[PDB]
Amino acid sequence: DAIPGPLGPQSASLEGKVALVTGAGRGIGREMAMELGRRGCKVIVNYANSTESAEEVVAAIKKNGSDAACVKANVGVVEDIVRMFEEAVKIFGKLDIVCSNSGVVSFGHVKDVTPEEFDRVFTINTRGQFFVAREAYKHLEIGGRLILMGSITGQAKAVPKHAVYSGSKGAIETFARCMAIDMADKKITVNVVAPGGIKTDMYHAVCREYIPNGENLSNEEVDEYAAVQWSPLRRVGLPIDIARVVCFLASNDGGWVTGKVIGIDGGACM
Amino acid sequence: DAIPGPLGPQSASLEGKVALVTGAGRGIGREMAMELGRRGCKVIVNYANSTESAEEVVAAIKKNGSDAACVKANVGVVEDIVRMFEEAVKIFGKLDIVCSNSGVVSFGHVKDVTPEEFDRVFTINTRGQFFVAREAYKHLEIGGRLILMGSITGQAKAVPKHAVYSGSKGAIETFARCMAIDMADKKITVNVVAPGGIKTDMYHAVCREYIPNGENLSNEEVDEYAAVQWSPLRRVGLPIDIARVVCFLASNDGGWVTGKVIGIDGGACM
Amino acid sequence: DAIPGPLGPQSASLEGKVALVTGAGRGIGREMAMELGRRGCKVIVNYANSTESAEEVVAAIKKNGSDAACVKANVGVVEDIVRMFEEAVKIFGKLDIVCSNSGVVSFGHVKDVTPEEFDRVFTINTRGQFFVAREAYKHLEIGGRLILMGSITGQAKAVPKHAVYSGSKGAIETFARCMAIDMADKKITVNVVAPGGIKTDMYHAVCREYIPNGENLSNEEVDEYAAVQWSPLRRVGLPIDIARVVCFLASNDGGWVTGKVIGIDGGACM
Amino acid sequence: DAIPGPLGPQSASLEGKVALVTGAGRGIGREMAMELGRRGCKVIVNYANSTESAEEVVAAIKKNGSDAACVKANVGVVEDIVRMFEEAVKIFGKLDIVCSNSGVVSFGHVKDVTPEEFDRVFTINTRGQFFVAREAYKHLEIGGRLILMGSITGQAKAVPKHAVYSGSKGAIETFARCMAIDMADKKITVNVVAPGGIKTDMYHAVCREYIPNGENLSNEEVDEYAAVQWSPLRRVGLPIDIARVVCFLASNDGGWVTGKVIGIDGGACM
Ligand SMILES: NC(=O)C1=CN([C@@H]2O[C@H](COP(=O)(O)OP(=O)(O)OC[C@H]3O[C@@H](n4cnc5c(N)ncnc54)[C@H](OP(=O)(O)O)[C@@H]3O)[C@@H](O)[C@H]2O)C=CC1
Ligand SMILES: NC(=O)C1=CN([C@@H]2O[C@H](COP(=O)(O)OP(=O)(O)OC[C@H]3O[C@@H](n4cnc5c(N)ncnc54)[C@H](OP(=O)(O)O)[C@@H]3O)[C@@H](O)[C@H]2O)C=CC1
Ligand SMILES: NC(=O)C1=CN([C@@H]2O[C@H](COP(=O)(O)OP(=O)(O)OC[C@H]3O[C@@H](n4cnc5c(N)ncnc54)[C@H](OP(=O)(O)O)[C@@H]3O)[C@@H](O)[C@H]2O)C=CC1
Ligand SMILES: NC(=O)C1=CN([C@@H]2O[C@H](COP(=O)(O)OP(=O)(O)OC[C@H]3O[C@@H](n4cnc5c(N)ncnc54)[C@H](OP(=O)(O)O)[C@@H]3O)[C@@H](O)[C@H]2O)C=CC1
Ligand SMILES: Cc1cccc2sc3[nH+]ncn3c12
Ligand SMILES: Cc1cccc2sc3[nH+]ncn3c12
Ligand SMILES: Cc1cccc2sc3[nH+]ncn3c12
Ligand SMILES: Cc1cccc2sc3[nH+]ncn3c12
Fold first, then answer.
1. Pocket flag, ligand 7, residue C202 (CB < 6 Å)
2. Which of D34, D70, D36 is nearest to D52 (CA)?
């Protein structure tokens, strides 16, 4: 049968692809846009509040040799998502890759979860991603790429006071399986990246909630724990670790990988 | 170490246990309450609309030798759930087992899902179960049992136009893992039963949506397909098939089974 | 459709069933035969070396009110398995349940595994179980039950120096999926129980190999670790914990549970 | 923290890496060596019987601009594996990547499996891979890559008469989890690629055994079935599909992916 795409290194090229990354002003998302751009991608950085950071990222991508632009939209508002895509398409003309990154964390024993906090998390983490995914489908080029952001907590077995957040990410893994069927009519592949503890603002904010008796841990102590307890490779994961895998899925190399959950932890067990 | 519970058949006894089953007026739930009662349980049948059916079930359980009562509550309304448990506890004095059964189906290509239909399904299937689970925790006896209703679609790989429903059930499997940690402080075990196509009203309504080119299938033809394509055991699953496993988890036998997903299909592959 | 089996507690009855348990002279297996007998089963206890213990168990089952007999066979020798079943059938006339329990542990960094030690473990743990399963098929009554012994290590993510043993148990989970299809022509259900640290001779021998820096731990200290680190339920698992689940699968209640892996840990994460 | 490796496309470069691929004279393996070479790798093609094909591949890689050499060894013989690595290291001086590809298929109802045919498959598929993995550890450069060959059958739910082969591949997934811990002391990442039906000699030989009533299917009919039934993407998988993912895992991009099973099917459900 016919070979799908070029043979050799040329199959990993993202040059000439237009990508949209939600929540790209900081954290993993910022690095996702940065790296995508470094591999020759035109990046559209979406943001909700971090305008400054957003703009800063856009400047950076250009400085690196790629074109970029930023769009504002609150993924928790379906109308904002609908608008974000209508503008996105006009900016560079087409849309090849979509990275649904935006998300929020939450901690608390089941007995203390309020309907307000449950809806807060699920609305961004689960509902937002579905509608971003829905719009991505409509605007993606035939053969496009949809990448959903999940988490190690979707399958973790030992994280206490973490049902709401874990459930929101767990549902994303199921979305991938089902969306991979529907979206295949446009040759779009759908996959879920499931990171496991990356140094970002979030990490700084809630890492201690994962460490048994960690209220006291100093920043370096947290990293020491993370590095040793969570990976045989003995090191803390960085956004670039996710960004690299995301580029693989987005390239020709990931053409036969669809409906899957790629766990990107250093071999962690949570 | 000390043996947990009696040795012998006495370990499967549900006699003297009070159970609450949501959506017990029909389908799998009705049979869940019926069977639980047959094993000596006092059943509280919850219902949303099927009052007649509800009452009918209560009469049946008594006729079989057990006490029962019914409570009305819409699981999509947190206040209703809160009330349902406050009344439940007063009826028979205590609450040992809770079976979160209620749920709704949905079909449609991703591109046609509306925010209204997404919220419709997630609100009952996922959000409702969380709050039923939350209240169950607060009112369950030390050593109680919480059983969540999932589905084969949470892990299925070939069902098209089924992302919303599949995602709502998928999140339930994650809830089980996390809730099993928090709720363990009261010795409560949390598990998810994941049926795979049971003859109920739902089955009559949407089975054809699972069968490639099944609009034409006659009722008997659907059952023939179900029996042959979905199980090496060559037969259609019945509510009693789930009801029996639910009794196992609810008994002393299921004391060391927690945080798990029990797939109850005839060895189906979807 | 027709209801499969009796409604009510009578569905959990094992009375009048003949079962064969391999490696039933001690550990989990001994308790499996004991409990099966307590629920009205005629047990055939197989053994390899523990004759004394074997006979002792047979005396016990009778003293409890059930008939039993013991057969000697080395599961690592296919001819022994073939013979064991030919004799087994003649003893009580038929064979309803088979519990493939026998197994051996092993520890060591990959770099130190010798072909001899690899074959030692795989020959009993994997190859033995396949041939026990093969013979069980041929001799089981239509509607019989085949239960394979697996382990938490089949899916564990953090146990070092444990590839050979973990791999032997992992393959058992796959055997269950496939055997459930072939063996279904005789209505036999095939399932895998996956315990997670049970107090038996094995536990006494190698538990410390699972505890980071545990050479020094005293017996009570090991149990303290096991109870706290491996279960939210805060207690060490006992053979009776597995024995109870095995009876469920062997009864009418487990009729619709086939091709599955039932994890029997206190919600452990390894 | 410090960024692991270069930022940008340079992270996907395999230039200057020495790789060893077992069973590289034909099928997926041949393409694995070819592609690895195209990305600037020095490939050592191992073979068992296909000398001609082996040599042909070596000529090809050189013609493409990379150096290659071939080594003969029967993975079912531990002494051969030990020798293969001692020679391998001397050829190009070092060893960065190892791809354990070699394998054999088998079909048959459980009841017809003979100890000879069970050992035949397990000895190459499971035992061989363990010892190849063991030797890879000893000779791999710090930061090396070990990639094990698995299959969709390790998790498949509907393939009949396939327990022996499925079990041999299933154990490989467990090996990955455990080996990822031990081998991490040398910064080596261990992962399992799990293809799902690739056009190779094997495919030509046994594809019909997967298709219900396929004895009659013509070659083109088989491909039609494969393309439609096994993938929403509607096409048959090719060796290049696996080869591309293998290059990702072998590069810097796969540095944080370890202890995982990458399913490389077109979203197949078996
Ligand atoms: N950090 C970690 O350890 C891991 C993170 N993840 C997931 O990866 C993703 C990113 O995490 P990380 O970078 O650490 O997070 P950060 O806390 O650093 O915040 C990342 C971003 O998400 C955005 N976001 C939040 N709400 C919205 C919204 N309403 N609309 C659009 N964007 C929004 C933020 O936008 P703005 O700032 O502009 O409001 C921001 O850009 C999340 O989905 C997270 O759950 C998964 C596993 C691990
Ligand atoms: N049938 C099947 O093949 C399978 C079913 N399931 C799950 O099992 C559960 C029961 O399914 P099944 O019996 O077939 O369903 P049915 O369609 O027969 O309806 C079952 C019940 O769910 C209830 N329900 C719906 N909304 C509410 C609500 N707002 N509050 C309280 N109860 C409500 C109904 O209550 P009322 O009628 O009183 O409004 C009813 O009692 C569901 O969660 C379903 O998703 C999972 C796998 C397979
Ligand atoms: N203990 C634990 O923590 C867990 C155990 N398991 C599995 O459960 C099973 C039983 O474990 P456990 O009771 O702890 O083990 P023990 O170490 O207590 O030994 C149990 C038995 O296995 C038998 N056995 C060994 N070789 C043979 C053989 N060649 N033929 C027949 N029988 C043989 C022994 O027979 P004899 O003494 O007569 O030679 C004995 O009867 C094993 O498969 C084990 O891997 C799984 C998870 C956890
Ligand atoms: N084809 C498919 O659909 C899929 C294949 N796989 C796996 O991928 C791998 C390759 O499959 P594929 O290329 O299709 O297979 P082929 O039938 O085309 O044969 C591939 C190779 O395996 C080799 N091999 C067999 N025995 C030995 C041995 N004793 N020592 C060294 N090498 C040996 C052959 O060597 P020689 O010819 O030199 O003897 C050959 O080089 C296998 O492990 C297979 O199980 C997994 C999923 C799907
Ligand atoms: C923020 C964080 C820190 C450490 C480990 C994890 S695992 C996960 N999943 N989402 C966030 N996280 C974290
Ligand atoms: C209603 C139904 C029919 C057939 C197969 C399935 S699998 C599933 N999950 N929820 C509902 N169903 C069905
Ligand atoms: C023998 C043992 C002790 C503690 C934990 C485990 S987990 C497992 N699997 N087989 C044996 N074991 C053990
Ligand atoms: C050889 C083959 C053909 C079709 C589908 C599969 S799935 C698998 N796993 N190993 C081999 N195969 C095949």
1. yes
2. D70
